[PDB]
Short mmCIF file of N, CA and C in Angstrom, two decimals:
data_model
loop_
_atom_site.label_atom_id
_atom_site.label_comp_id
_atom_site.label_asym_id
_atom_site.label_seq_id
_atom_site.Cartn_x
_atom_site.Cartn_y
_atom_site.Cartn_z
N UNK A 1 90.33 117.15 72.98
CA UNK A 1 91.02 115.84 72.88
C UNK A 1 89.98 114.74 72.61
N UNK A 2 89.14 114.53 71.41
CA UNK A 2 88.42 113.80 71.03
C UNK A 2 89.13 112.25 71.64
N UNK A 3 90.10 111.97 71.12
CA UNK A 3 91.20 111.04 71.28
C UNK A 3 90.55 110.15 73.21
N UNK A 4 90.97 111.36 73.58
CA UNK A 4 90.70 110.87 75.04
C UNK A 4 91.84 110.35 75.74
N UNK A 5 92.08 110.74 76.74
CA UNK A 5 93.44 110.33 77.18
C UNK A 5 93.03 108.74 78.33
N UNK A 6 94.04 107.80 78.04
CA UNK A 6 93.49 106.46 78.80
C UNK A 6 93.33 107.02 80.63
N UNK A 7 92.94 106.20 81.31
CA UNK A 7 93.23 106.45 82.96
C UNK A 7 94.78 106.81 83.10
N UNK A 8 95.37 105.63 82.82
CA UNK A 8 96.69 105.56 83.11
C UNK A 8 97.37 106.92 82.99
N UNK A 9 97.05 107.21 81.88
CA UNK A 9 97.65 109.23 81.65
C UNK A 9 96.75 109.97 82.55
N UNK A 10 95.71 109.83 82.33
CA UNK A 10 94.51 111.06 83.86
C UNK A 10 95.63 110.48 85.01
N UNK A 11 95.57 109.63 85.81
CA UNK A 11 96.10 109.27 86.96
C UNK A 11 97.81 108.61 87.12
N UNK A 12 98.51 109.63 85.94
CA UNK A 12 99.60 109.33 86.02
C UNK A 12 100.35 110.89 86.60
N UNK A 13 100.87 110.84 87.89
CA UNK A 13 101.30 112.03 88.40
C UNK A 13 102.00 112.73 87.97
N UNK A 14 101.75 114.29 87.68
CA UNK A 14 102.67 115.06 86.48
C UNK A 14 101.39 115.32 85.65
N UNK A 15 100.53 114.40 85.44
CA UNK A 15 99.94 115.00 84.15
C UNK A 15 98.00 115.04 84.51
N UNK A 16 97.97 116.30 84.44
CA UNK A 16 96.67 117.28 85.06
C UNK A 16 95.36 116.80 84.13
N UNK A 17 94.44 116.47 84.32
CA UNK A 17 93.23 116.28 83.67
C UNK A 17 93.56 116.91 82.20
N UNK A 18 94.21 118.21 82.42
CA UNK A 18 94.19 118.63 81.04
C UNK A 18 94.77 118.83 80.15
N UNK A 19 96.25 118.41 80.51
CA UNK A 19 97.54 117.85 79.75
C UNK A 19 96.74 116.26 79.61
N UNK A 20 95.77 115.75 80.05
CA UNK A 20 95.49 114.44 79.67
C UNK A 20 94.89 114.83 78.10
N UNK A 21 94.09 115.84 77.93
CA UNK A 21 93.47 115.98 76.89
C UNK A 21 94.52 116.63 75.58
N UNK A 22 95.27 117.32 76.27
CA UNK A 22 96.40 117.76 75.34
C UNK A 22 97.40 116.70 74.71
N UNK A 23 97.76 115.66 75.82
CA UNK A 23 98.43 114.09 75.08
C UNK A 23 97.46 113.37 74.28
N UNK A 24 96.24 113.39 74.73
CA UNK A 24 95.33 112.48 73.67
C UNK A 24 94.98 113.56 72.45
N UNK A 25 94.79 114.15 72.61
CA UNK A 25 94.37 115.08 71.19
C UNK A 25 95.66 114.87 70.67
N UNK A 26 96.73 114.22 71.11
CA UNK A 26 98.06 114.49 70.46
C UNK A 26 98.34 113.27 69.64
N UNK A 27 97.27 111.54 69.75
CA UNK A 27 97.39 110.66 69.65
C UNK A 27 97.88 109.81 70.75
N UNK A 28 98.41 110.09 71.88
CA UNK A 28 98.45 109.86 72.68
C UNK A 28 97.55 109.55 73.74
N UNK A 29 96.30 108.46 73.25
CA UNK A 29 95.49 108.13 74.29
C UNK A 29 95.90 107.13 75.16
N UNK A 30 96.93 106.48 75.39
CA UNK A 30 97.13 105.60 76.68
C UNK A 30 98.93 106.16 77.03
N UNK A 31 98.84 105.63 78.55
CA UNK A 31 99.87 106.58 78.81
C UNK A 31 101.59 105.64 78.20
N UNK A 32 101.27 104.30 77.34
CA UNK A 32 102.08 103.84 77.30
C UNK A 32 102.10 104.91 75.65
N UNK A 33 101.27 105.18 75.22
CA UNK A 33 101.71 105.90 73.87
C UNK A 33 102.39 107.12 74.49
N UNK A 34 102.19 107.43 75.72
CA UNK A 34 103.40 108.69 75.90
C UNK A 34 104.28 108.29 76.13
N UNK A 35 105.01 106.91 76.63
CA UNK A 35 106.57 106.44 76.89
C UNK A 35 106.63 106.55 75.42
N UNK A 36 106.48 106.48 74.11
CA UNK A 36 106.78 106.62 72.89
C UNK A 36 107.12 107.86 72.57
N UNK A 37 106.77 109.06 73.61
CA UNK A 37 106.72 110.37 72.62
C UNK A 37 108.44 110.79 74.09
N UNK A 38 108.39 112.08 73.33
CA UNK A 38 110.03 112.14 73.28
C UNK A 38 109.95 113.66 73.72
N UNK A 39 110.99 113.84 74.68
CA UNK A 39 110.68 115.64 75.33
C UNK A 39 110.65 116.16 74.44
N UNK A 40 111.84 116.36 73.19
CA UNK A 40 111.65 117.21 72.20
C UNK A 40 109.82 117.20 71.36
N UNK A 41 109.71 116.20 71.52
CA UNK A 41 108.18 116.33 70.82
C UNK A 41 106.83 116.59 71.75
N UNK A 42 107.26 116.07 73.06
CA UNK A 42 106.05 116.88 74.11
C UNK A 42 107.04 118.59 74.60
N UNK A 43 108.17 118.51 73.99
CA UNK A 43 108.52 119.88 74.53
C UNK A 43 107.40 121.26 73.71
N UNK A 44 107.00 120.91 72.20
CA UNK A 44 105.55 122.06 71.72
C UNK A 44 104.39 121.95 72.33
N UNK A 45 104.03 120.95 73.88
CA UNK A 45 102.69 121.31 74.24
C UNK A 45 102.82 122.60 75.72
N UNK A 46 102.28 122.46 75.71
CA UNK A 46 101.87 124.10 76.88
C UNK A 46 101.89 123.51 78.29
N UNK A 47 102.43 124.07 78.76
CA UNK A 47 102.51 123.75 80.12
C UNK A 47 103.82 122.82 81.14
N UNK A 48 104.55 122.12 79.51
CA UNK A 48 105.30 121.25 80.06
C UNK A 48 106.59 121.71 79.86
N UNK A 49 107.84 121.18 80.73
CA UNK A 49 109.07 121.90 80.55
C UNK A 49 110.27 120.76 80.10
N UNK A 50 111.21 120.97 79.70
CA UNK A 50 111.80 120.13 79.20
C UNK A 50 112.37 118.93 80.15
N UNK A 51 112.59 119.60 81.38
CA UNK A 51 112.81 118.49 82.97
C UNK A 51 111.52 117.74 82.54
N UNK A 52 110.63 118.28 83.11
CA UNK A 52 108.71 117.99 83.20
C UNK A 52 108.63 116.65 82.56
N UNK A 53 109.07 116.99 81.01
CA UNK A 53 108.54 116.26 80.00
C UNK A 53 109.60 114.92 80.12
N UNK A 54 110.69 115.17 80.57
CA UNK A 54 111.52 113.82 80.99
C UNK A 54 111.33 112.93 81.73
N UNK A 55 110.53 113.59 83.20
CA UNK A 55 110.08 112.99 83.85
C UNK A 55 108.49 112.05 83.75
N UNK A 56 107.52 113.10 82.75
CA UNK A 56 105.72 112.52 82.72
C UNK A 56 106.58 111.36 81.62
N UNK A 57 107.25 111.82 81.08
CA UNK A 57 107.45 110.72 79.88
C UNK A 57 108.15 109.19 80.47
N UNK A 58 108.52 109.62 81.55
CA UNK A 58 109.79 108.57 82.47
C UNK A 58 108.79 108.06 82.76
N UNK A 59 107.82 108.59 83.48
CA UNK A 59 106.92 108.13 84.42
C UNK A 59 105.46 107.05 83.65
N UNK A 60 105.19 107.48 82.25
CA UNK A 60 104.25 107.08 81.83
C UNK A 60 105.64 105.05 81.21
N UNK A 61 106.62 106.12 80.64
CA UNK A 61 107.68 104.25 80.53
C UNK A 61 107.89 103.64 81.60
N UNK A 62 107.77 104.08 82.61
CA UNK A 62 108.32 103.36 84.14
C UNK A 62 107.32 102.63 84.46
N UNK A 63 106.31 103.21 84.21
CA UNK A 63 104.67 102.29 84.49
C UNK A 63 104.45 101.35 83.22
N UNK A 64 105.01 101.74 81.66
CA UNK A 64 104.15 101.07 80.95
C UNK A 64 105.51 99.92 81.14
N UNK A 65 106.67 100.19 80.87
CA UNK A 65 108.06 99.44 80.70
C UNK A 65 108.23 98.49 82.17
N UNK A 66 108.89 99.64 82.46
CA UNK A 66 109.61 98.64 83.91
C UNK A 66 108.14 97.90 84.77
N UNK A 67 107.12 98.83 84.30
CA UNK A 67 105.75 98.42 85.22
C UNK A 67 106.33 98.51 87.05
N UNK A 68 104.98 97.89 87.54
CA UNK A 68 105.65 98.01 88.96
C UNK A 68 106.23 97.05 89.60
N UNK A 69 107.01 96.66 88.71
CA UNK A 69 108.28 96.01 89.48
C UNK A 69 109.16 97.21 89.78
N UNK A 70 109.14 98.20 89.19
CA UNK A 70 110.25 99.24 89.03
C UNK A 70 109.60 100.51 89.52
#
């Protein structure tokens, strides 16, 4: 993952040091570029399940979107 995944994705719960490198190698270097990506499209990386991917994806929009008000 040349890319590099931002903090926010390393220390966003759900997603392991090395699904960090698997979202950034994906273009996905900050975790608000993963509220952009979509289960069906994190459903081809390894490790993640289609719940999974509803949720890291919820979780990376809940932080970048609602932020922590929400």
């Amino acid at each position: 993952g040349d890319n590099k995944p931002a903090d926010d994705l390393l220390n966003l719960e759900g997603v392991d040091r090395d699904l960090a490198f698997k979202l950034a190698a994906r273009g996905v270097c900050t975790l608000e570029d993963l509220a952009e990506q979509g289960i069906d499209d994190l459903a081809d990386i390894e490790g993640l399940t289609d719940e999974k991917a509803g949720a890291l994806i919820m979780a990376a929009r809940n932080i970048c979107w609602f932020g922590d008000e929400a």
